[PDB]
């Protein structure tokens, strides 16, 4: 249930959170034996209330006493609906509320306005993304066994070439387009491996074939996971690195990018070819995300870029 070992983030489902006798208690079908009792309550913990759960104001009081962030997310924890805002660590605020302020916003803003540094960040994002493609498509054979048998030499050549291109070109405007070309080739490779036939990527949900729908669902979950990552870091969604400065919710899409083609896309084609239900697809996606430590990776990346930007 520990959703991110890097963030001390826990997912609670099928239980009520209430305060009896001055201690926050979980009313669950397992009673005393539920693992929720092992939840450490400290300023380092952060909760994610899941499906079928409710919380009492008294609990909110006790958690605030202990300084524990709370957030509501849907099935499996991908769509993050609402959460507590996290503080910002600077010398002029200084409340004693015992809430672990986080300093990453200052680091982010310290460079966000300098375009050259912003570009350097974009490059760093894409380096990470490609290396996660090469990892999941080649190094690990779980997909191979599942049925996603694809050629390697063509994929390796394409990825090598795109990586070679990343280290070049002057502005965001090229990077976006280079990624788009890589995207197209990856789609073609996946369709060939899946024997799905010809594939064309419609957008704004105009597609009707299973592949398109499953891609949309997968991307929706990925966005939710990224939103969780940013919220844990406290960075507002508007300070995008690679998407346009006017794009509402740009940053989450920047962060979501580092898994779409690594983990969502193959599963979308696999499930479409296998003829799965939408529910089966959702469960498979969440299982893949859990297996890959996705949230932890996207946390590590954001921290790495912050430290590297100095």
């Amino acid at each position: 249930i520990l959703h991110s070992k890097r963030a001390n983030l826990y997912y609670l489902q099928h239980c009520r959170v209430l305060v009896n006798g001055g201690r926050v208690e979980y009313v669950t079908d397992e009673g005393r034996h539920s693992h929720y009792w092992n939840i450490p309550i400290a300023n380092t913990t952060s909760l994610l209330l899941g499906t079928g759960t409710s919380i009492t104001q008294a609990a909110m009081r006790e958690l605030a006493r202990a300084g524990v962030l709370v957030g509501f997310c849907g099935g499996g924890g991908t769509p993050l609906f609402s959460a507590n805002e996290v503080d910002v660590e600077v010398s002029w605020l200084t409340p004693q509320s015992e809430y672990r302020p986080t300093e990453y916003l200052q680091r982010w803003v310290g460079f966000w306005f300098d375009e050259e540094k912003r570009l350097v960040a974009a490059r760093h994002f894409q380096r990470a993304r490609l290396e996660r493609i090469r990892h999941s498509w080649l190094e690990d054979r779980v997909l191979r066994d599942a049925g996603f048998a694809v050629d390697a030499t063509a994929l390796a050549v394409a990825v090598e070439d795109s990586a070679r291109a990343l280290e070049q070109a002057p502005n965001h405007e090229h990077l976006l387009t280079e990624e788009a070309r890589l995207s197209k080739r990856l789609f073609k490779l996946a369709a060939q491996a899946t024997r799905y036939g010809e594939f064309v990527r419609a957008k704004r949900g105009s597609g009707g074939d299973p592949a398109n729908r499953f891609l949309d669902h997968g991307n929706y979950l990925a966005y939710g996971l990224a939103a969780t990552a940013t919220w844990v870091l406290g960075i507002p969604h508007g300070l995008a690195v690679l998407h346009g400065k006017t794009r509402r919710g740009g940053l989450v899409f920047d962060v979501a990018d580092l898994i779409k083609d690594s983990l969502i896309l193959p599963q979308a084609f696999l499930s479409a070819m296998r003829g799965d239900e939408e529910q089966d697809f959702r469960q498979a996606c969440l299982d893949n995300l859990s297996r890959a430590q996705a949230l932890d990776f996207m946390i590590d990346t954001l921290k790495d870029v912050a430290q590297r930007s100095t």
């Binding site: 009896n20 006798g21 001055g22 450490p40 009492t56 009081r61 202990a66």
Partner: protein, 954 residues
């Protein structure tokens, strides 16, 4: 005017509602209308709707006062069909969807649980001493130990923690179950030097959490009690504690060395004990912000006293359990106790510790549910519906006033004064008020207490008949509390085994009548072994002396506080003739009222007269108690303002108040109204006032005028009774003399009260008539002066449904300088310049109900104000508020220096026949005893031991 009308009517009503509205507005929905209309027109519409409204009628009228705003004008009929803004619910179900049962407001239950469990794991460790073990195994001569086991335990605890340590350090070390080294034993500060080590509660020695546990362990048989009792030390009281406070004795150094000898080792070897303590410490450490709260926790009366309560109640119960093996390691060498019957080792030491800890935890979990599971009185017809005779109509005024502030009291607390005059059936009013304050929706629980030196069966039965209550509803507690003598007798008997907690909760000289269910008791697991206490708690309503509740605050030794304290913590309190106490007794009463407010009970004072200084002192006590209480129940942070109330023949009133100043100004206002209103009512009685110069009591001891007009102590009463019997009646006069004093046996007192209650053209048809200071709780009377309270209340006995006063009290005739010392609050510090006695016309409570050497009433006012309001009164400085303004309650100090029922003491009357040396309403002891033994189902001698008691002087 632009109206929208909506209907929520039912069945027949909605046909009528349609008939009305349809004439004033077009129908725009199945139950709605909307039109413009004149203001006068709307008023007429409202009147017509109200003219004929079923209970089913429900109509709401909305006004659109302009662009983008609307308002609610009025509702006709059942307002429950709408919320405040005039909305209507979408769905409703009788299913319990809210489930408010699941969680509770005991916002400190966990803290007390942790502290208690920690103490239990150490509470009886000191019994591991070689001296104690030798005492345990010795069946011969019993020896009193150098120190009680608990003090040894506390020193062990302090040694384990080590001086100067932070709470975290010792908690961490205890939690680390790897550690077993006993090298710290060398650090132990043996008390058996020539030099005495510093008190473990000193600033340098123990940190807050450790101090809390230390106090909780050392105070598990008797409160600490030293000699230093000044304010400067009382404010830091836990620190001054020392060995001498805790029953240290004189003995040879060898025995003290045996006390500090542990040849068999500490319980640290046992697997469970180490694991359980480590787990408890870990849980305590993981609790959020507990360490920072520690220092405030040490001074909190609520936390400490609840934990003490739970601690003994566990230790007492388990000590009575038979032994078992599954707990701990059966091969443990040390033991905890010796079986009383077989005189053999019973329980292993670790077995005892773990058992007490387990049971304490169970209690901690159980306690919040007690108020949910205990019996209650609900929907009693007598309380609810109105009274028919105007003589008592004011009682309905009071009931309505209480009903008007129910939920406010439920939140903030309540402090009401029933100030009404005698003879107005105050008992019913008090009962109705308390029943009103209960939640109508599960029922009431309250107690009626009075200041009688001891209570008889009759007064309880009278209450039962006045209230219309069954034997399963109202319980009665007879007699009074026992004295220290028997307790020390018993501890001499029992300390040989060390199970001092085995002393019964209620002294067996006490007894309780109640005819309800016992097995339903939520506390049966721990009180079924003493049916008396279980009955005391089970009864929805109980009547008793005030004496029976004091052990809550006055039980310096033994577990006698358990029962009454639980009673306070689960029921409300009524005090009646509370003012009848003597001055030295009020401080204890204030302590009781303070605790009553500390544990969430609600208080109702009842009397015909009540000095303002008295109520101010008590109120400030209750206010302080409630303020402490609200830190641990209900919604945190809410401000303290108690719901005060007043009741009277003329009026009833209530108001919230935050501090004494406003309260007194309100109380004085109510007094001003009462006395002014009383002066309108015609006088009912007329007072009047000796050729006695001799000094020999018999000769000087040795009606007709009254008849032609219209038709302080036991020993002098007996003397004059003998004199009258010798003299006889004068010419043309037949005298019937009914004697009823306080030293008659309870059996006889009950019979006499029964006869007097029954007997006092239609009058002459009664059988007996045709055939022919304890009174303060007729056509004419003769009174010896004692005080204004006695003067008026005795005067209240006259023509209730003409009085002559002796100019001086017999002790004044004897020339005693503070003549009124016994009856009144005269003292050598506070004397009168003389004892020779407008108020003569109207005998009203006025003079002492208000506060304004030559006026006894003035002296009494001064004594009250000095004793319980002033900070620096004359004479010794031990004012009342020290009880809650300091950590005093951690010791028996104030119970010692301001004792209850103080002074010369009785002995309950081993055959001692050698010491013995040989009318209307008279009673034969044998006849009544024989009858009542059958009514009671007892042997005659056993019945005598139950009701033949008298509180004679030794």
């Amino acid at each position: 005017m632009n109206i929208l009308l909506v209907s929520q009517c039912e069945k027949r009503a909605l046909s009528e509602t349609r008939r009305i509205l349809d004439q004033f507005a077009e129908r725009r929905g199945e139950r709605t209308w909307q039109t413009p209309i004149t203001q006068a027109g709307l008023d007429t519409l409202r009147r017509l709707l109200k003219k004929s409204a079923r209970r089913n009628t429900a109509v709401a009228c909305h006004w659109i006062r302009g662009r983008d705003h609307s308002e609610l004008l009025w509702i006709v009929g059942d307002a429950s069909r709408f919320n405040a803004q005039g909305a209507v619910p979408t769905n409703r179900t009788c299913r319990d969807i809210l489930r408010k049962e699941d969680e509770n407001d005991w916002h400190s239950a966990e803290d007390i649980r942790l502290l208690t469990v920690m103490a239990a794991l150490f509470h009886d460790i000191g019994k591991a001493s070689q001296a104690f073990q030798a005492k345990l195994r010795n069946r011969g001569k019993p020896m009193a130990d150098a120190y009680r086991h608990e003090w040894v335990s506390l020193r062990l605890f302090e040694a384990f923690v080590g001086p100067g340590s932070s709470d975290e350090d010792w908690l961490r070390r205890l939690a680390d179950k790897r550690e077993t080294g006993d090298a710290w034993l060398s650090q132990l500060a043996r008390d058996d030097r020539q030099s005495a080590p510093p008190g473990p509660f000193q600033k340098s020695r123990l940190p807050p959490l450790a101090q809390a546990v230390g106090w909780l362990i050392v105070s598990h048989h008797r409160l600490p009690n030293g000699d230093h009792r000044g304010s400067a030390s009382l404010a830091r009281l836990p620190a001054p504690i020392q060995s001498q406070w805790c029953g240290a004795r004189d003995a040879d150094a060898k025995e003290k060395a045996a006390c500090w000898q542990f040849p068999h080792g500490l319980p640290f070897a046992s697997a469970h004990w180490r694991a359980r303590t480590a787990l408890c410490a870990q849980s305590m450490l993981e609790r959020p912000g507990l360490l920072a709260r520690g220092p405030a926790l040490l001074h909190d009366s609520y936390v400490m006293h609840v934990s003490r309560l739970i601690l003994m109640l566990a230790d007492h119960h388990y000590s009575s359990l038979p032994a078992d093996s599954r707990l701990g390691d059966p091969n443990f060498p040390l033991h905890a106790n010796t079986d009383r019957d077989s005189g053999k080792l019973k329980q292993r030491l670790d077995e005892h510790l773990l058992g007490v800890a387990l049971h304490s935890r169970k209690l901690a979990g159980t306690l919040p549910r007690l108020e949910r599971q205990l019996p209650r009185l609900a929907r009693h017809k007598g309380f609810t519906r109105r009274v028919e005779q105007p003589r008592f109509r004011w009682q309905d005024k009071a009931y309505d006033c209480a009903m008007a502030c129910r939920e406010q009291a439920m939140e903030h607390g309540f402090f009401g004064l029933n100030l009404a005059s005698t003879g107005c059936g105050k008992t019913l009013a008090n009962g109705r008020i308390l029943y009103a304050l209960a939640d109508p929706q599960r029922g009431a629980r309250f107690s009626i207490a009075l200041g009688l030196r001891s209570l008889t069966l009759q007064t309880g039965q009278a209450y039962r008949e006045r209230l219309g209550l069954g034997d399963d509803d109202l319980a009665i507690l007879v007699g009074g509390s026992a004295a220290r003598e028997l307790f020390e007798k018993q501890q001499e008997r029992l300390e040989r085994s060390g199970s001092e907690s085995a002393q019964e909760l209620l002294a067996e000289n006490s007894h309780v009548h109640f005819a309800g269910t016992l097995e339903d008791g939520p506390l049966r697991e721990w009180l079924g072994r003493n049916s008396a206490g279980n009955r005391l708690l089970q009864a929805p309503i109980l009547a008793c002396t005030i004496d029976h509740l004091m052990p809550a605050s006055e039980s310096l030794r033994g577990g006698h506080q358990i029962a009454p304290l639980l009673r306070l913590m689960t029921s409300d309190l009524v005090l009646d003739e509370v003012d009848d106490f003597d001055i030295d007794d009020l401080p204890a009463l204030s302590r009781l009222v303070h605790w009553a407010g500390l544990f969430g009970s609600r208080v109702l004072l009842s009397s015909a007269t009540l000095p303002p200084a008295l109520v101010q002192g008590l109120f400030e006590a209750y206010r302080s108690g409630r303020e402490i209480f609200q830190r641990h129940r209900g919604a945190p942070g809410r401000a303290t303002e108690i719901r005060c109330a007043w009741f009277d023949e003329f009026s009833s009133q209530s108001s919230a108040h935050g501090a004494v100043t406003s309260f007194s100004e309100a109380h004085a206002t109510f007094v001003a109204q009462r006395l002014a209103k009383l002066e309108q009512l015609p006088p009912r009685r007329q007072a009047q006032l000796v050729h006695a110069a001799g000094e020999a009591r018999p000769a000087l001891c040795r009606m007709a005028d009254l008849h032609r007009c219209h038709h302080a102590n036991i020993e002098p009463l007996i003397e004059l009774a003998q004199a009258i019997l010798a003299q006889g009646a004068p010419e043309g006069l037949h005298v019937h003399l009914c004697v009823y004093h306080s030293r008659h046996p309870l059996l006889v007192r009950s019979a006499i009260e029964r006869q007097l209650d029954e007997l006092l053209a239609a009058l002459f048809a009664r059988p007996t008539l045709a055939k022919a200071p304890v009174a303060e709780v007729y056509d004419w009377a003769i009174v010896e002066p004692s005080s204004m309270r006695s003067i008026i209340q005795l005067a209240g006995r006259i023509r209730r449904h003409n009085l002559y006063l002796l100019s001086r009290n017999i002790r004044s005739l004897e020339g005693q300088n503070p003549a009124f010392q016994r009856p009144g609050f005269e003292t050598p510090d506070f004397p009168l310049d003389s004892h020779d006695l407008a108020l003569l016309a109207r005998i009203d409570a006025s003079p002492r109900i208000v506060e304004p050497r030559s006026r006894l009433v003035d002296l009494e006012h001064r004594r009250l104000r000095a004793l319980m309001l002033a900070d620096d009164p004359p004479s010794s400085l031990l004012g009342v508020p020290l009880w809650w303004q300091t950590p005093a309650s951690l010791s028996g100090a104030l119970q010692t220096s301001q004792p209850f029922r103080a002074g010369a003491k009785e002995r309950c009357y081993s055959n001692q026949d050698n010491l013995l040396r040989n009318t209307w309403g008279t009673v034969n002891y044998r006849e009544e005893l024989v009858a009542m033994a059958g009514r009671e189902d007892l042997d005659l001698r056993q019945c005598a031991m139950r009701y033949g008691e008298v509180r004679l002087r030794e």
